[PDB]
Design a protein around this ligand. Structure first.
Ligand SMILES: Nc1ncnc2c1ncn2[C@@H]1O[C@H](C(=O)N2CCN(CC(=O)Nc3cccc4c3CNC4=O)CC2)[C@@H](O)[C@@H]1O
Ligand SMILES: [Zn+2]
Length: 201
């Protein structure tokens, strides 16, 4: 795998960092990361499941898959790489109900690596702002198809009728940053596994 392909992922990871409203409570205090490793995930069965669904979505969306590269933070990265994203692990909870959530800002996804609101932080030091423990984030291929634009909380079980996803747009008394929600696990492929540390400013 080319170093230039990985430089592009590294650049997306670094440039999409934003200052969070919680002052770093969930994901820690940092302006940049120390990127340790970028691995391309090659799971043929998951890739075929993804491309089969992408073709179905494109056909239902004027021959346009509306694919985006987006981040996903989770304590379950290893199960995701082996078994794929699974909506059965999603329960009504979160702004847009029982879906699989993605961010275009790496720092947003970083707030979910150790759990919701950062959980209790890293397993070894119980620190949400740990600068020592190595974190992992996924940089995913996500099929949005016809995405339903929403500003306020809308607890869905599935995509709205005629749609393939939900796009959560930033609003005054709502989201600070965008979020993208799918309700079918086969609509995302965990393309890159990023191993990194947040860096002390
Ligand atoms: N194959 C699998 N095996 C085990 N767990 C799996 C799995 N595929 C997905 N999951 C897991 O399911 C969990 C899940 O759906 N949940 C729990 C969390 N909840 C809220 C939410 O996702 N918010 C949210 C908002 C914005 C970005 C991000 C997130 C999460 N990660 C991000 O980057 C929505 C429902 C998630 O923590 C994880 O990805
Ligand atoms: Zn730690």
């Amino acid at each position: 795998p080319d170093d230039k392909e990985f430089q592009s992922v590294e650049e997306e990871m670094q440039s999409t960092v934003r200052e969070h409203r919680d002052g770093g409570h969930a994901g820690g205090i940092f302006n940049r990361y120390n990127i340790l490793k970028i691995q391309k995930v090659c799971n043929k069965k998951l890739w075929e499941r993804y491309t089969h669904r992408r073709k179905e979505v494109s056909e239902e969306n004027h021959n346009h898959a509306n694919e985006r590269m987006l981040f996903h933070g989770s304590p379950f990265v290893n199960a995701i790489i082996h078994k794929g994203f699974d909506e059965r692990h999603a329960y009504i909870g979160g702004m847009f109900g029982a879906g699989i959530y993605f961010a275009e800002n790496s720092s947003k996804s970083n707030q979910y690596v150790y759990g919701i609101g950062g959980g209790t932080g890293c397993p070894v030091h119980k620190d949400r702002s740990c600068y020592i423990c190595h974190r992992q984030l996924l940089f995913c291929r996500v099929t949005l198809g016809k995405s339903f634009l929403q500003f306020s909380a809308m607890k869905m079980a599935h995509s709205p009728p005629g749609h393939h996803s939900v796009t959560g747009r930033p609003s005054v008394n709502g989201l600070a940053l965008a979020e993208y929600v799918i309700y079918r696990g086969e609509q995302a492929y965990p393309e890159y596994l990023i191993t990194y540390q947040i860096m002390r400013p």
